[PDB]
RNA sequence: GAAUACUGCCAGCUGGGACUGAGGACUGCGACGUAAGUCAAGGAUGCUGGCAUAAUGGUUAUAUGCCGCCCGUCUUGAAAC
RNA sequence: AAAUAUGUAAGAAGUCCUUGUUACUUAAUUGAACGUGGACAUUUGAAUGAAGAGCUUUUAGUGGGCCAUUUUUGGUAAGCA
């Protein structure tokens, strides 16, 4: 007669085992991180003990902000910016490093501040500015329902897999980080420190390659 | 029709990741580490204090 | 303040409604654009986009076409679609018993179909028969045989037809077309 | 006041190859080209005719025809809002192939036979060529490697 | 006043905005500036060709 | 630049074929993050030896810190910088407590008196002089008297008020 | 054998202050609870008081603080001696 | 003999294997070009991005320019050309 109520009970079993899913997906994220921080202190360590010197794997990851205005950008940085999706100032992009993208950070260099990113940044970042590109109308995420939607077909399935994917930089991170939208960033709420900020970072001011100091960055602005 | 973030509203919080309940629970983020006893190298120390 | 690569705040350069303000017209745009959006069929879609069109985009097919087009293998029994207007042809002497769906029929080829034995119906006959495209066979008439088309893209080494009143001698056919009036295009 | 002529301002392109004038090889006689290869134009001056002019030196292109002593080049040359398309006839001194597309062409080689060899051993087939991707960890010893302190140097003339 | 003879000022500008473009290559291309040596026979070929289509279809 | 650290660089020069393993340089550095550190260490370490970073490796950056931060020290420091005209090397005599304070003092100093910046100015030699009688300045072996006594006559107050009632006076 | 600095993390605790309250039957995702239901969970409700007045708001004049060069036009360029 | 700039390419329109036409070419089905039937079944052949790509028609105003950074010519130099 009304026929809702088991439509809606077999709505929450499935949702529920998705939700159980979800959980147990996430408590292995978790030991696989801890047991990775964990695996390169005691590397870092057991080198030490044997007279010689582990090396840290270089950065796979780069976020990416935008500092220069709009006016007077020259053409080739101008188009780089818009191919990296830095369209506004105060704007943010992550970056799957490599030969190709190197050349771009250091051309684009004078107009950006970029630097090796954390879990930290990653998570605070996403859940407050996360943002989607479909159809494209830029939703909010809010709920796991929209990323089993346009990407269950990567295994993709909730926010917590999205940034798994993000940190291990896996297969589908173009597919992931094109679905993400650009992240509309704040200005710094203590400010930049450094009174001149377009020089470059290591003659006392803001752009180029701030390696971990980004997270700083990121987390006052955001 | 209004976005309520997460990291405030743990409503909202869990019915995202659900895994935060357990988080909280054994708290997670002041875990403690066993402890290790190396001791690294005088090649090392010596080339530390170097000059 | 935000960097553009293209045109903001641009119309799409499609129509979507009729320019017309015929009343029937637009009755069958509201039926058709009901039922495109309430029946995932291709066929709904393309029929309305071919009734917003214009007179020079719609032209009219003969007669004729329809014959040649159910030669096709398999088209022998198929509702022929028009969106448009169907024109009589006196170089053809047979004509099949076929269904014919249009909007606007010339009398010859209303008495042509008749006596053949067919069928002379409307869009909304079609769509209460075949609510979705159950085989159909759009026909489209020729656009670019128009006569203001040969002067399109006038120029040297073309072969466009100039804009011209009067014809014959005296009417360019002189210096620039000639090889002894100096050159030829 | 400015000339404009055919050959101006090529006091140096149509130059030879210093200890390279005089005669050509007949490798470049011999050389076949078949229509779509793809050709890279470089003049020379001791033939005159066949001669592509001094906008074409550099380029490359496909070839469309062939005659008795040249072939029938295309090119695609820039000018104003659009690229027209250039027809170029040209004798063979002028002209060499382009070794990109043998090199592409025994990459598809390579690429059909490492496709055949993964469907006979299964999963991993892996064409696609990734650029240069970062670093990863190691360990270095310091066994015969032991640091050593530099500093900066002072300043001195030595003139 | 003098008449000042040319400026390369904007004119990439104005090539850049409506953005310089290939031209749209296609298959089958033209035939016009080939031998007519060939051609000539490649005309019979396709003639024989299409009659032993025509054949074999029947 | 800032309030300064110390590090330790290490530098590889990354392997080959021709030659794997090679001869790991290390470098001394005074700086007040990891990423100048290592700037200026691609510096130095291209100035003398045939690398730059495009072809190198940090292999390790490591902090120091003072072994007796608490003990007054001595420090001989050997300099050069670049002038208006040309360049010149330099030495100096500093007293105070730490290898990176006196380094402060010593940036502070040299922009005032001859006006160079940090970016022409390098560091050659930082070295603690164990022993007493081998300073060569008087500004620092006036301090090194036995029973060492001084005021500070007219020392001025930077009060908080605006109106005072007081008249004060400054007597140390 | 310690603590303390420095850096970093907590899906860590606790207070103070300012701006906003869009929308308008239910539907959804969730959380607590055995349950019933409850909830800070797809946009604010509750309680109390004051004003019959100029309480509030508007219009106009005046005063005060800050800012404000005469329109049109030729022009690369006009407040233009 | 640089640096900066600069041309081309990074596939399914392709790769491999049978077999058909020619009045062209070859000493010669020999070759050339175009096809015929299978397999290679979109990891189908670098990175990033895409506010979709492409095609037409018709028409306005404009067809005196100027400043700055770098490379520059003439000039004593110029708010010079």
Request: charged share 30%; hydrophobic share 35%.
């Amino acid at each position: 007669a009304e026929q809702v109520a088991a439509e809606r009970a077999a709505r929450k079993a499935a949702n529920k085992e998705k939700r159980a899913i979800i959980l147990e997906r996430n408590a292995a994220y978790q030991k696989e991180y801890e047991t990775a921080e964990r695996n390169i202190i005691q590397a870092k360590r057991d080198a030490k003990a044997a007279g010689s010197y582990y090396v840290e794997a270089q950065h796979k990851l780069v976020f990416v902000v935008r500092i220069k205005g709009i006016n007077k950008i020259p053409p080739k940085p101008r188009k780089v910016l818009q191919l990296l999706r830095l369209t506004r100032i105060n704007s943010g992009t992550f970056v799957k490093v490599t030969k190709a993208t190197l050349e771009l950070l250091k051309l684009i260099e004078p107009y950006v501040a970029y630097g090796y990113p954390s879990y930290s940044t990653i998570r605070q970042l996403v859940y407050k500015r996360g943002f989607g590109k479909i159809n494209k109308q830029r939703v909010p995420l809010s709920d796991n329902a929209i990323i089993e939607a346009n990407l269950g077909k990567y295994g993709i399935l909730s926010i917590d897999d999205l940034i798994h994917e993000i940190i291990t930089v896996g297969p589908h991170f173009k597919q992931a980080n094109n679905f993400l939208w650009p992240f509309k960033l704040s200005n710094p709420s203590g400010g930049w420190g450094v009174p001149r900020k377009f020089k470059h970072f290591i003659q006392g001011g803001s752009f180029g390659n701030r390696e971990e100091f980004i997270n700083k960055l990121v987390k006052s602005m955001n | 029709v209004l976005k309520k973030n997460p990291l405030k509203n743990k409503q909202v919080l869990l019915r995202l990741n659900p895994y935060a309940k357990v988080f909280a629970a054994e708290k997670l983020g002041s875990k403690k580490a066993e402890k290790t006893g190396t001791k690294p190298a005088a090649v090392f120390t010596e080339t530390l204090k170097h000059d | 303040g935000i960097d553009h690569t293209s045109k903001q705040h641009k119309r799409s350069g499609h129509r979507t409604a009729p320019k017309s303000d015929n009343v029937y017209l637009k009755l069958l745009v509201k039926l058709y654009t009901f039922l495109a959006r309430r029946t995932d069929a291709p066929f709904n879609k393309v029929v309305l986009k071919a009734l917003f069109l214009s007179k020079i985009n719609r032209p009219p097919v003969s007669v004729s076409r329809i014959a040649r087009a159910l030669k096709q293998e398999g088209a022998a029994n198929k509702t022929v679609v028009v969106v448009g207007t169907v024109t009589d042809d006196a170089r053809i002497f047979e004509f099949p018993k076929t269904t014919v769906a249009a909007l606007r029929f010339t009398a010859g080829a209303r008495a042509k179909i008749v006596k053949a034995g067919g069928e002379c119906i409307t869009l909304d006959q079609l769509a209460v028969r075949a609510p979705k495209g159950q085989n159909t066979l759009i026909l489209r008439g020729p656009r670019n045989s128009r006569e203001a088309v040969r002067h399109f893209g006038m120029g040297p080494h073309k072969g466009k037809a100039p804009r011209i009143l009067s014809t014959g001698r005296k009417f360019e056919r002189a210096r620039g077309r000639r090889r002894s009036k100096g050159f030829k295009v | 006041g400015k000339s404009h002529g055919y050959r101006s301002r090529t006091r140096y392109m149509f130059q030879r190859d210093f200890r390279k004038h005089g005669a050509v090889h007949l490798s470049t006689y011999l050389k076949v080209y078949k229509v779509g290869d793809i050709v890279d134009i470089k003049a020379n001056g001791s033939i005159q005719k066949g001669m592509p002019h001094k906008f074409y030196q550099g380029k490359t292109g496909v070839v469309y025809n062939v005659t008795k002593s040249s072939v029938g080049v295309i090119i695609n040359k820039m000018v104003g809002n659009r690229y027209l398309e250039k027809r170029l006839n040209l004798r063979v001194e002028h002209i060499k192939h382009s070794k990109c597309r043998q090199e592409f062409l025994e990459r598809v080689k390579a690429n059909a036979a490492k496709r055949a060899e993964a469907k006979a051993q299964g999963v991993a087939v892996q064409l696609k060529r990734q650029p240069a991707q970062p670093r990863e960890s190691r360990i270095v010893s310091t066994e015969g490697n032991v640091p050593q302190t530099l500093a900066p140097v002072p300043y001195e003339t030595f003139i | 006043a003098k008449s000042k003879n040319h400026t390369a000022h904007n004119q990439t500008r104005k090539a850049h905005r409506n953005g310089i473009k290939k031209p749209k290559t296609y298959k089958y291309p033209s035939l016009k500036g080939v031998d007519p040596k060939f051609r000539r026979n490649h005309k019979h070929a396709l003639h024989g060709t299409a009659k032993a289509l025509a054949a074999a279809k029947k | 630049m800032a309030h300064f650290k110390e590090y330790q660089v290490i530098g590889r020069r990354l392997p080959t074929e021709s030659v794997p393993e090679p001869k790991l340089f290390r470098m001394r550095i005074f700086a007040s993050n990891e990423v100048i550190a290592k700037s200026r260490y691609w510096y130095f370490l291209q100035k003398l030896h045939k690398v730059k970073k495009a072809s190198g490796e940090i292999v390790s950056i490591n902090q120091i810190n003072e072994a007796h931060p608490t003990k007054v020290k001595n420090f001989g420091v050997w300099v050069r910088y670049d002038s208006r005209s040309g360049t010149h090397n330099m030495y100096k005599e500093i007293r105070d407590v730490s290898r990176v304070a006196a380094v402060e003092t010593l940036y502070q100093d040299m922009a005032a008196r001859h006006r160079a910046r940090f970016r022409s100015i390098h560091i050659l030699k930082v070295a603690e002089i164990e022993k007493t009688a081998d300073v060569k300045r008087q500004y620092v072996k006036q301090f090194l008297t036995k029973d060492l006594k001084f005021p500070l006559p007219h020392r001025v107050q930077k009060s908080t008020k605006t109106f005072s009632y007081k008249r004060p006076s400054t007597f140390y």
